[PDB]
């Protein structure tokens, strides 16, 4: 990170604020009128006192109450207008920033999410954006509303007697440098607090997602001690912020009151008095007194504003990170399905050992390739390379004769349907899980046909509402095989030219697996398929069986040929 300024963060924000200039312009006009009303109301002491209540004609006091009430009506109207317009613009800007942040996170590479924690990014969405919102609404309204008041008081004081606006001038730069120093301090503390809040969210999220492990292994004390640590650190950094703010405010108040001391001392001179009455000074010492109150408001709201300025700076740094590399530009309507690995070598980020070494694998159109091998040998990695979750080091992966990097990511991933090894469902009705991202495109007859092909219809008919049954947060209201079959139906609904089954039948019994296999045989007789299997009963009819070991292909063939040749596959078949 690298701090900027308040002006510099507003110069970064400006392209976002530009579409909403009208609200800002009317808010600025209303702010000017509000400051004018305040200053004019304070400058009523001069006629009230000089043109005495009984010394001079009461003509002033005849009309003065109506003037006060009218000024208050005008000030109220302009205060409403300025508050509402600035808050509307601020809400719009914060909404835009939140949406940009969400889209940016959705566009990051998978390797980014491997190295992160959900709590940190969730904190970026929740805590930092709420800091921007709170600051830019409340603290910004107050800052502008006291700055205008201070400027009005300065103008009035310089108008009545400039020989004291001179001390105001000589004291303004000191206040400016003090405020700038304290603001930099505040921005640093705020960034620290953002990191600590990310840690707090990560701690709570880890306890919540692993609740069953906490219970079963008795991890209550450890989780409680980790939350004690992080929450105490959050409190201590908040106290750092408070210490800075409450040591800064009295110093600035003292500097500002040196002006009041100077005005009293200067009036103590006889060479300055007798030039002005009692009433001009009735305005001037009333105005110094009434100036020290907006100063406090301004300084006191500075920490809250800087909590928003620091959050904005953090979001700006995030919003120009590198997203998923997408520099291909040829869409594909429907691939034939002819995927070919050509001498590819892949190393996971930060791992220094190849997960795959020299993979020369052809997956012809309409043929099924089965990857078998021991656990940890690199089958899910091949499946992850086909969908471009990770990018390879050497070699080429071609689809329809062109490298995968030549296509658009959306266009490419439209050609692949994947049942992953770790099934993830959503908190949605069974029907909105089978048709996850295409609920407007697939009818209920198509969804029921997919659910029937995945052997999921019998258990769905027994549920509370059928296809409208809400399943839990991650399908938690289902058994493991039922979650697997819903994921299978989700993949089978979309007639994608490439289907990848990454051990799709691990949680299924044998009869269920055989029914699903019977459906797959008829449905996918002409679609490229890649089955990753540990059970060799699932892949006996594959057109080519590929045995992976430590990341290299150790043999390839059909079931009958691989049963002869007495290789690795014959050993796997024998021990099963």
């Amino acid at each position, epitope marked *: 990170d690298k701090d900027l300024s308040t002006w510099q963060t507003f110069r970064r924000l400006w392209p976002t604020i530009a579409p909403f200039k009208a609200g800002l312009i009317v808010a600025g006009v209303a702010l000017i009128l509000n400051a004018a009303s305040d200053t004019f109301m304070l400058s009523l002491l001069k006629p009230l006192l000089d043109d005495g209540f009984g010394k001079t004609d009461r003509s002033v006091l005849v009309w003065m109450p109506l003037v006060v009430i009218g000024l208050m009506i005008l000030r109220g109207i302009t205060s409403y207008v300025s508050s509402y317009c600035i808050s509307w613009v601020s809400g719009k800007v914060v909404m835009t920033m939140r949406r940009r942040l969400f889209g940016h996170m959705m566009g990051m590479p998978v390797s980014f999410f491997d190295k992160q924690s959900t709590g940190t990014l969730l904190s970026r969405i929740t805590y930092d954006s709420e800091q921007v919102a709170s600051s830019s609404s409340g603290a910004l309204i107050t800052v502008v509303r006291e700055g205008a008041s201070i400027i009005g008081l300065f103008i009035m004081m310089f108008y009545y007697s400039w020989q004291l606006s001179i001390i105001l001038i000589v004291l303004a730069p000191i206040v400016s440098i003090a405020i700038r120093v304290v603001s930099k301090r505040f921005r640093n503390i705020s960034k620290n607090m953002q990191n600590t809040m990310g840690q707090v969210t990560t701690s709570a999220e880890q306890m919540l997602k692993g609740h069953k492990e906490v219970l079963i292994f008795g991890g209550q004390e450890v989780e409680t001690k980790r939350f004690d640590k992080v929450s105490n650190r959050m409190r201590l950094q908040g106290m750092k912020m408070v210490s800075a703010s409450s040591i800064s405010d009295p110093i600035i108040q003292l500097i500002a009151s040196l002006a009041l001391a100077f005005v009293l001392y200067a009036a103590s001179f006889p060479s300055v008095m007798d030039s002005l009455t009692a009433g001009t000074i009735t305005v001037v010492f009333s105005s110094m007194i009434a100036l020290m109150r907006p100063l406090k408001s301004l300084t006191n709201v500075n920490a809250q504003f800087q909590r928003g300025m620091a959050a904005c700076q953090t979001l700006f740094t995030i919003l120009d990170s590198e997203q998923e590399k997408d520099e291909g530009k040829r869409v594909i309507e429907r691939a034939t399905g002819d995927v070919e690995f050509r001498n590819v070598t892949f190393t996971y980020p930060g791992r220094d050992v190849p997960a795959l070494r020299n993979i020369n694998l052809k997956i012809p159109a309409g043929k099924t390739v089965a990857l078998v091998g021991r656990s940890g040998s690199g089958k899910s990695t091949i499946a992850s390379l086909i969908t471009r979750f990770y990018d390879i080091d050497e070699g080429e992966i071609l689809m329809d004769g062109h490298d995968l990097r030549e296509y658009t990511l959306a266009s490419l991933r439209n050609q692949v349907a994947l049942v992953s090894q770790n099934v993830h469902l959503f908190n949605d009705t069974v029907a909105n899980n089978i048709a996850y991202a295409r609920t407007e495109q697939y009818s209920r007859e198509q969804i029921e046909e997919a659910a029937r092909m995945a052997y999921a219809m019998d258990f769905i008919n027994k549920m509370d509402n059928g296809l409208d049954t809400v399943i839990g947060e991650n399908g938690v209201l289902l058994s493991g095989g039922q979650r697997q079959r819903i994921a299978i139906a989700r993949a089978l609904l979309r007639d994608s030219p490439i289907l990848i089954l990454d051990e799709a039948t691990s949680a299924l019994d044998t009869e269920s697996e055989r029914a699903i296999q019977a459906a797959l045989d008829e449905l996918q007789k002409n679609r490229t398929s890649l089955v990753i299997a540990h059970r060799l009963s699932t892949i006996e009819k594959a057109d080519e069986i590929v045995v992976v070991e430590d990341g*290299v*292909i*150790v043999e390839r*063939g*059909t079931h009958n040929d691989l049963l002869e*040749h007495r290789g690795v596959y014959a050993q796997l078949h024998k021990m099963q």
Partner: nanobody
Amino acid sequence: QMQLVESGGGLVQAGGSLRLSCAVSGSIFSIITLAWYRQAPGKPRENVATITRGSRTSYADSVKGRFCISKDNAKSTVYLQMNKLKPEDTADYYCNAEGPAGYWGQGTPVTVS
């Protein structure tokens, strides 16, 4: 690309001994599966011996106890030692790398009187 060339024998007498070689290049030699196939003039290709990563050799029943398949990691070469040959063994011999759908050799005829 992986290529492999046999350097074998020609005509030998019955009951003799032969030793075939097949230098494998451009491969992860210590992991992949190597095998020896033979093709009689009329019969289709038949597996004869297979060796795997752990040097776990397997022999076709029709030839078990007479042949011996071994590989030298340093030289990147796989050997087929034949003992007590028979006229029925007269065929064209191929080395194979990683499976019946993998990479094949050009062939080396072997004749037994």
